[PDB]
RNA sequence: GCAGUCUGA
DNA sequence: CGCCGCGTCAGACTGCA
DNA sequence: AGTCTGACGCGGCG
């Protein structure tokens, strides 16, 4: 039907083409009888008939003469539906500037006339003249001249010139200028200017002029002379039942125009004085602008509510405009809503649906089955049979919903599992019953939630609901490969109670023939659920051939775990239940069953677990009482010790021996120590019971306290809240965050008195007000991520690439935060993984690293694996299915056609509501290695490093790195390289507050440029008494002191030059300001001695990493690899210079002087090394160390935010976003391609252009890839429907109008707008036929 | 609340809101993303065209459901045509291209 | 409200995740039956026909 | 009866292909005059279609072969 | 009459619903005493004493 | 249809 | 200095042209 | 246009 959407400016003749007649009168309807007025905003003559197939005058009333026009009144006899499509037009008596192309920064009219907006706005609103044609005078074209500067020009140059004002003047300027000549005139001024500050404006204007000439538009179309009129059924004038007419807003904003225009059409015939037609043209201009976009010119027109009228442009933008409100999501028939209720008898695939709802939702299906089975003869008879609810209607309905899934949805749908399809079990209540296991996936709890039910109508939609969306297919999370269908807080308590053991339980020690005898013994009452017993258990093991092998042996178990073995499917081991099963043990049991046996045994096992956990939690009688919160008897003692200590701190402050600062800090520290002692005493009293064993002896076992069992199961609560029930609530905080120094020494079993409670309320309301206002940030970040990534689909089985990021376990100091197995499970290797014994391939090139390959990696102890990733994927417009990895929710390689972008954005933005708002001590034993080292062996023999970016790592027995630290400049370490270390040993030492400059090779120190009083000060402190020298700073000197730079150099005992190893450049150390040197001239120094001393998160962090925002004080990186120097100084900035050995040497950096610059004149830097300490900007990382460094930086800095809160997100989902951020490139060399220099293009465009240009041996373009924030990269897509529906709609629509763009519907949103099958998933197979049958 | 079919809005031809007006539940933006994260393109197309906005598609779909034929004939939603008219009521010539 | 005899215990999953399991004698004794009064208006209009 | 389509997914190695193949066969059964190849067990045509998929009786290749054969033999019925 | 979940107590530390539950039991245990004395038709001396 | 208010998750 | 954004779904009640 | 106006945000971005 259509393959793209075209957009451009509308010619006046095109607006007359759309139109079906001119609207001349502002009257909307007739008040006497409610017929439309002739030539009104509602006119049956123009906009079509008011009733179906009848004329407005009645002279024609049936479709016998359909297509006629009546001739008594001019109304054409057609369907009334044509009132939604037929437009009108107002012929503006004067031209009128379109406010979008005038005010939507940058102003296209201003940018086209090379005229400032603050002056075009003056010319347009009749406050200044402008000269259309200059002539032989000082009346140059774009000159504005105020009226008093005009009437004197009336005589200065007569009538040889013509100056005008208003939209006529601007239209004459636009219509008069020539595009093909003006851009040609500008192209040489751009090519000739060497200050790029003007080249920016020149290329902006050249882009605009080339866009106007390339598209078919003309400039003078940015000034309306005809105004289109929306069809009247889209600004409906609803008759109120109250005897009144409720008006639209446009109907005012049109009427308000049609008056003034009409009024002006009189003043052009009455020839009224030109001042009053000036004021009327100004009013008409501002009225048309108020119609198109209200409030762009400040004070907005408001009618009758003291509230601004709604524009035409207010109809299409914002959260309430068409795009987000009616097009991207819409209300939906065959849908219902109700409260949800648990219903634990359910199976994982079904849900309870009320009969009263399933009778309404399935109504046309029921009509069909009634007419089919002869129980009715007409849809009205069947409608009567259904609304009477005869007893056969229910037998019909039980068939109509037999295998028919319904979708259940609970808003907010934070992630993919928020919509799941279940089979309806007709229940009799009014509450939708929802299986307990899917609540975690929904985030649903039964304290009043509601759900929407939707009915798939078509066979394709029912099969999609059954094969893709059914809840038995969604047991794994798409964010990470861990189960989402996990037993929760009553099943874990039931199975925790069942699996535990007690020491003298009833029936201990006996020997049982199997699990069946254990269940018989339990239900008979002859043995306890915890009787430690010997049961002969038979377990089935998967052999290599694939089949199961039975093994039978007498396990030492309890009666409970033996009973639980009856529901565990065959392929699993016994040790999976031979333990007290917490929550994590149960989720691990389910994950093991999914990995070993597959989906169907797991979906059966989950239901069996749920049933048995509920059953035995009921049998448990597990109940919380006031005696379960056992307060430790030491508490009232422990507190009354800390209350003493604060006294002997307070009596020190009253004695003035301490300031308020350290007094406050020590009081807090001792109160936190007392809090930890109280909580430790509580937990140690609570986690242990004393019981008499079989021999009558006493014996300690783990407690059976109800609070403790709920805590230890992971069922509900944790020691952090058991602490508040039975310990002390501890130090609470102020509204500002400064923690109040006297804590809540009382807990919730005792009473908090009124002051402790008031203090508690501070943090309580901070938490609640934080939750109420950070959901907005989380939702907005989720929406930005979806709209940056909506169109990314897997479109290929393999891109054939060889590169990919190197995955290593994250180490943040002494400990691993994630092993390699977490970071490579499910990825495909990019290059061969070979054993630590070199050249023996442990893993071939392209394998999907599943669990078997991953534990194979870990037992052979490989620590760094190259891995394919979406940022490195060669596929144009998509991702190949190998460069992505595993489908996390399924556990196999990803299907071709998955919308991985939406999955990534949802997986990232769903946990967003859980985020908020000196020497090195080696921990483990291993072999120490040093990397990126520039080091020296000092005169004391120990190792002293003189690098700044060197690191120190530990290597265990296996070759893997276990810990890593950063050794600063001037760090002197007390160990050797390769030296084995024990636990606790300090390896490296340094001065945290100063940098020492280090001797390279021994010899005499010799001072150069050391004139006293001008560059140096010889001083000594009365507290130190020791002489020293300090180099004069910039503030310590006048002009002439900065000219002479001090220096040192090493001169050996014969007075000759000594050379640093590697080059014959002398051993100079150039001295910085405030360099404190203690040593004297003429002394001989040794290699390794220090010459001189120079002294020194949350959700917005993720929103600022994805928006790639430059930090406040960025770390300056070395632009090229070369040799450092300092050329010139003191014009606000010191000019660092990196001269390489090859290529064009000179590069310069104007570094601010105050910035601590940790590099010196002599040493080298490589490309992208840190010149100054600080937070790196991501743009600079991308520019200087490649896309791999910037994706590694963003992945790590986002996962440092998510891991802090315990959130797990597989980092594919982050690379998928980074791939969409660095999606644009910038042409650095045009090559033989058509892109102009410095122009930002799509990366896929330039890459395929290089491909096709290298296809015939020519030279292809070269580029620098950009990094854009998610908002800027969302608004810079090739689609204007994906970027106009996101945000900033007027910008996107005006730039796509003046550019003449074309949206070819290649994304997911473009096809959702227009009602098509998305190119993802089951629509992908369609969207390919559409291509392989239209591109041929 | 439940609704198979009922009255529809006037400008956009989508269903009304709330059990007072016989409702119809909003399939908002996040639910459209949730369907896009599955491959449920046909479910999504029927949520967009024949359940709400398509004015011919929904009557054809109703007669099909009654006739035991679970097949949609989806066209263009009426809101998209409303959006085209509202963008053409600016000075901007947006147009479907074949 | 009314004084109900509550026990604190998990019962076969019917009190799962903030749910409440009520005996039938709380419905028989009408302990929580409430009366609601709805006002419906039928306004006779003057129409042009 | 059908509770999980995992068996029918190994036979048609894609989930977005299972939906299209099963919907084509289910429409052949629902509005065509065609009969199931498995015993109709009081199922819907969608579930019958999936039960045919999982027993190797139906895939897109078999559907195309059968449609080709029926098209040719109905073109043969022209006297 | 109603069965509530104990796992809603220790997570959200609303212990006041346990103590109330223990007091509302005691406060009813007194009632069941008087209900006995009113059914045995004890003297008002014994009722007043209790 | 809109605005205001309140509420629920 | 002006412009652009600032979660989702839902129920109720008024008053308004 | 006179208000016996409202303002009384914030944080990026260009
Ligand atoms: Mg809830
Ligand atoms: Zn007529
Ligand atoms: Zn790839």
């Amino acid at each position: 039907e259509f393959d793209a959407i075209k957009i451009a400016l509308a010619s006046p003749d095109m607006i007359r083409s759309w139109s079906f007649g001119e609207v001349k009168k502002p009257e909307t309807i007739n008040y006497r009888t409610f017929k439309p007025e002739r030539d009104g905003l509602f006119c049956a003559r123009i906009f079509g008939p008011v009733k179906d197939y009848e004329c407005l005058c009645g002279k024609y009333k049936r479709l016998k003469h359909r297509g006629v026009i009546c001739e008594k009144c001019g109304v054409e006899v057609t369907q009334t539906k044509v009132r939604r499509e037929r437009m009108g037009h107002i012929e503006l008596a004067s031209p009128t500037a379109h406010i979008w192309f005038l005010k939507s920064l940058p102003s296209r009219i201003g940018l086209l006339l090379d005229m400032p907006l603050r002056d075009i706005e003056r010319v347009l609103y009749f406050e200044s003249y402008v000269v259309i044609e200059g002539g032989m005078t000082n009346l140059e074209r774009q000159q504005i001249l105020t009226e008093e500067q005009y009437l004197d020009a009336l005589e200065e140059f007569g009538d040889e010139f013509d100056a005008k004002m208003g939209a006529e003047a601007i239209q004459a300027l636009l219509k008069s200028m020539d595009l093909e000549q003006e851009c040609e005139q500008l192209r040489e001024e751009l090519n000739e200017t060497n200050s790029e500050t003007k080249r920016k404006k020149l290329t902006k204007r050249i882009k605009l002029l080339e866009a106007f000439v390339q598209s078919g538009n003309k400039p003078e179309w940015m000034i309306l002379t005809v105004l289109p009129v929306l069809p009247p059924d889209l600004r409906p004038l609803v008759p109120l039942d109250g005897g009144r007419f409720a008006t639209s807003d446009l109907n005012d904003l049109y009427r308000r125009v049609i008056n003034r225009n009409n009024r002006l059409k009189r003043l052009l015939d009455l020839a009224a004085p030109d001042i009053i037609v000036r004021n009327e043209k100004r009013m008409l201009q501002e009225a048309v602008d108020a119609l198109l976009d209200n409030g762009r010119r400040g004070r907005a027109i408001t009618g009758s509510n003291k509230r601004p009228l709604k524009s035409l442009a207010d109809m299409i933008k914002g959260k309430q405009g068409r795009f987000r409100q009616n097009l991207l999501g819409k209300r939906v028939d065959y849908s219902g809503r109700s409260v949800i209720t648990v219903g634990p008898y359910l199976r994982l695939h079904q849900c309870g649906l009320p009969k009263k709802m399933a009778l309404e939702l399935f109504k046309p299906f029921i009509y069909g089955k009634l007419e089919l089975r002869g129980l009715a003869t007409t849809i009205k008879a069947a409608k009567k049979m259904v609304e009477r609810e005869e007893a056969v209607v229910w037998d019909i309905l039980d068939e109509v919903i037999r295998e028919h899934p319904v979708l259940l949805n609970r808003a907010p749908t934070l992630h993919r599992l928020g919509i799941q399809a279940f089979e309806p079990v007709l229940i009799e209540g009014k509450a939708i019953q929802l299986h307990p296991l899917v609540c975690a996936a929904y985030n649903a709890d039964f304290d009043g939630d509601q759900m929407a039910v939707h009915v798939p109508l078509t066979l394709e939609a029912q099969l999609e609901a059954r094969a893709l969306m059914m809840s038995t297919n969604n047991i794994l999370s798409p964010a990470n490969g861990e189960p989402i269908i996990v037993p929760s807080q009553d099943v874990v308590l039931g199975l925790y109670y069942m699996t535990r053991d007690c020491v003298n339980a009833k029936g201990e020690g006996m020997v049982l023939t199997g699990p069946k005898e254990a269940e018989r013994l339990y239900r008979s009452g002859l043995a306890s659920l915890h009787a430690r017993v010997k049961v002969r258990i038979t377990e089935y093991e998967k052999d290599a051939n694939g089949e199961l092998v039975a093994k039978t042996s007498l396990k030492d178990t309890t009666v409970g775990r033996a009973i639980l073995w009856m529901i565990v499917p065959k392929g699993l081991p016994y040790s999976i239940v031979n333990q007290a099963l917490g929550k994590k043990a149960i989720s691990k049991m389910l994950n093991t069953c999914y990995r070993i046996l597959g989906l169907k045994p797991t979906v059966i096992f989950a239901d069996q677990i749920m049933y048995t956990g509920f059953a035995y939690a009921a049998r448990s009688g597990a109940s919380v009482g006031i005696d379960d919160m056992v307060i430790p008897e030491k508490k009232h003692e422990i507190i009354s010790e800390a209350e003493a200590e604060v006294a002997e701190i307070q009596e020190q402050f009253q004695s003035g021996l301490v300031t308020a600062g350290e007094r406050y800090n020590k009081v807090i520290d001792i109160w936190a120590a007392a809090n930890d002692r109280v909580s430790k005493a509580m937990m140690d009293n609570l986690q242990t019971e004393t019981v008499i064993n079989r021999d009558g002896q006493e014996e300690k076992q783990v407690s059976f306290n109800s609070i403790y069992m709920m805590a230890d199961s992971g069922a509900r609560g944790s020691a952090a809240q058991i602490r508040q029930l039975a310990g002390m609530r501890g130090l609470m905080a102020k509204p500002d965050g400064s923690i109040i120094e006297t804590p809540i020494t009382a807990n919730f079993r005792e009473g908090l008195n009124v002051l402790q409670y008031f203090i508690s309320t501070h943090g309580a309301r901070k938490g609640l007000a934080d939750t109420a206002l950070k959901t907005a940030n989380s939702g907005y970040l989720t929406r930005r991520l979806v709209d940056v990534a909506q169109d990314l689909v897997v479109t290929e089985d393999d891109c054939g690439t060889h590169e990919g990021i190197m995955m290593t376990p994250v180490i943040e100091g002494g400990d691993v935060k994630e092993p390699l197995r977490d970071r490579v499970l499910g990825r495909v290797t990019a290059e061969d993984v070979l054993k630590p014994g070199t050249a023996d391939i442990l893993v071939p090139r392209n394998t999907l690293l599943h669990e078997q390959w991953c534990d194979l990696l870990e037992e052979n102890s490989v620590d760094a694996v190259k891995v394919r990733s979406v940022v490195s994927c060669d596929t144009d417009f998509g991702v190949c299915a190998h460069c992505y990895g595993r489908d996390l929710a399924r556990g196999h390689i990803i299907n071709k056609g998955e919308a991985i972008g939406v999955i990534a954005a949802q997986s990232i933005g769903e946990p967003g509501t859980q985020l908020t708002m000196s020497s090195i001590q080696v921990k483990n034993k291993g072999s120490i290695k040093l990397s990126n080292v520039k080091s020296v062996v000092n005169s004391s023999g120990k190792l002293v490093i003189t690098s700044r970016n060197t690191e120190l790592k530990l290597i265990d027995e296996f070759g893997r790195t276990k810990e890593s630290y950063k050794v600063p400049y001037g760090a002197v370490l007390a160990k050797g390289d390769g030296e084995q270390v024990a636990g606790g040993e300090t390896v490296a030492n340094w001065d945290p507050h100063t940098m020492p400059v280090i001797t390279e090779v021994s010899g005499f120190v010799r001072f150069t440029d050391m004139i006293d009083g001008q560059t140096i000060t010889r001083q000594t402190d009365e507290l130190t008494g020791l002489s020293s020298l300090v180099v004069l700073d910039s503030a310590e000197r006048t002009a002439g002191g900065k000219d002479l730079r001090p220096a040192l150099k090493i001169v050996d005992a014969q007075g000759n030059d000594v050379l640093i190893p590697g080059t014959d450049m002398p051993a100079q150390y150039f001295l910085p300001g405030k360099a404190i040197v203690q040593l004297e001239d003429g002394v001989q120094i040794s290699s390794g001695d220090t010459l001189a001393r120079i002294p020194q998160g949350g959700l917005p962090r993720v929103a600022d990493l994805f928006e790639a925002r430059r930090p406040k004080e960025p770390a300056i990186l070395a632009e090229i690899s070369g040799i450092v120097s300092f050329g010139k100084e003191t014009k606000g900035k010191r000019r660092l210079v990196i001269t390489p050995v090859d290529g064009s040497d000179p590069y310069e950096e104007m570094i601010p002087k105050w910035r601590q610059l940790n590099v010196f004149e002599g040493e080298r830097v490589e490309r992208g090394d840190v010149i100054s300490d600080g937070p790196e900007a991501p743009h600079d990382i991308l520019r200087l160390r490649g896309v791999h460094a910037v994706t590694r930086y963003i992945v790590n800095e986002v996962q440092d935010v998510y891991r802090l809160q315990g959130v797990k997100i597989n980092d594919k989902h982050i690379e998928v976003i980074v791939r969409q951020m660095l999606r644009k490139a910038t042409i650095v060399n045009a090559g033989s391609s058509d892109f102009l220099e410095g122009e930002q293009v799509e990366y896929s465009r330039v890459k395929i252009a290089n491909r096709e240009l290298e296809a015939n041996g020519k030279v292809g373009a070269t580029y620098s890839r950009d990094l854009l924030g998610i908002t800027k990269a969302s608004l810079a897509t090739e689609s204007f429907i994906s970027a106009a529906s996101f945000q900033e709609t007027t910008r996107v629509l005006t730039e796509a109008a003046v550019a003449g763009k074309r949206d070819e519907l290649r994304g997911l949103k473009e096809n959702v707008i227009v009602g098509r099958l998305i190119p993802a998933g089951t629509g992908y197979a369609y969207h390919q036929d559409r291509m392989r049958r239209r591109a041929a | 609340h439940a609704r198979s079919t009922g009255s529809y809005s006037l400008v956009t031809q989508q269903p009304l809101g709330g059990k007072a007006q016989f409702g119809g539940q909003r399939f908002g933006e996040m639910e459209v993303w949730a369907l896009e994260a599955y491959g449920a393109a046909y479910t999504l197309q029927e949520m967009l065209t024949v359940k709400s906005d398509d004015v011919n598609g929904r009557t054809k779909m109703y007669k099909n459901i009654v006739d035991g034929n679970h097949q949609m004939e989806p066209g263009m939603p009426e809101s998209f045509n409303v959006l085209l008219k509202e963008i053409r009521s600016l000075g901007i010539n947006i147009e479907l291209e074949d | 409200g009314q004084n109900m005899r509550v026990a604190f215990m998990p019962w076969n999953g019917y009190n799962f995740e903030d749910s409440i399991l009520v005996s039938e004698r709380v419905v028989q004794e009408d302990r929580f039956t409430t009366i609601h009064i709805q006002e419906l208006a039928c306004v006779s209009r003057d129409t042009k026909l | 009866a059908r509770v999980t389509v995992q068996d029918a997914v190994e036979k048609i190695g894609n989930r977005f292909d299972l939906v299209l193949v099963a919907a084509r066969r289910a429409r052949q059964m629902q509005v065509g005059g065609k009969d199931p190849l498995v015993p109709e067990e009081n199922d819907k045509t969608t579930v019958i279609a999936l039960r045919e998929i999982e027993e190797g009786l139906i895939n897109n290749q078999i559907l195309d072969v059968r449609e080709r054969q029926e098209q040719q033999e109905q073109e043969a019925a022209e006297l | 009459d109603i069965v509530l979940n104990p796992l809603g107590v220790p997570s959200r530390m609303n212990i006041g619903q346990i103590l109330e539950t223990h007091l509302g039991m005691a406060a009813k245990g007194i009632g069941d005493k008087i209900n006995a004395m009113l059914k045995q038709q004890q003297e008002v001396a014994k009722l007043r004493e209790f």
Side-chain angles (χ1 to χ4, degrees), chain A residues 799 868 873-874 880 883:
Chain A
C799 70
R868 304 179 77 172
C873 185
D874 269 310
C880 74
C883 285

Side-chain angles (χ1 to χ4, degrees), chain A residues 693 695-709:
Chain A
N693 76 336
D695 317 307
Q697 193 181 287
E698 283 268 321
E699 176 173 339
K700 288 209 172 173
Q701 79 184 349
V702 188
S703 177
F704 276 92
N705 185 290
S706 306
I707 291 284
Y708 180 73
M709 288 202 312

Side-chain angles (χ1 to χ4, degrees), chain A residues 649-650 653 656-667 741:
Chain A
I649 298 299
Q650 205 62 26
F653 190 69
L657 301 177
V658 296
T659 55
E662 72 252 18
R663 193 266 302 154
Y664 170 83
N665 273 327
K666 285 190 293 186
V667 162
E741 71 181 21

Side-chain angles (χ1 to χ4, degrees), chain B residues 3-16:
Chain B
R3 160 199 175 116
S4 66
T5 302
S7 83
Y8 295 98
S9 175
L10 211 57
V11 178
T12 51
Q13 283 277 332
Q14 299 161 4
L16 286 186

Side-chain angles (χ1 to χ4, degrees), chain A residues 1010-1031:
Chain A
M1010 290 281 287
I1011 60 170
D1012 182 44
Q1014 292 310 123
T1015 194
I1016 45 154
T1017 289
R1018 162 79 75 176
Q1019 77 184 355
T1020 184
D1021 308 313
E1022 291 85 4
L1023 276 77
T1024 309
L1026 167 59
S1027 175
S1028 171
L1029 309 159
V1030 179
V1031 174

